[PDB]
Amino acid sequence: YIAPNPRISSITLTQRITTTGPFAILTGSTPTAQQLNDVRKIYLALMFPG
């Protein structure tokens, strides 16, 4: 599982640090052991569509 470049969210999601929002909180969060297992459970259902 490949993360994107970390300079993408740093020039366009947290450009102004005076404010916060719903997106600007979630960037500083890491997946747990089971919340990564749900991402593995997402991509199984994208490959077998119906």
Binding site: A24, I25, L26, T27, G28, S29, T30
Partner: peptide
């Protein structure tokens, strides 16, 4: 008590969830 700590670089956004270990 019972607090945990890991390697984090988000100074604001992860310590919000650190009080969730307190509460």
């Amino acid at each position: 008590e019972g607090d945990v700590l890991s390697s984090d670089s988000g100074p604001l956004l992860s310590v919000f969830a650190l009080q969730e270990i307190m509460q």
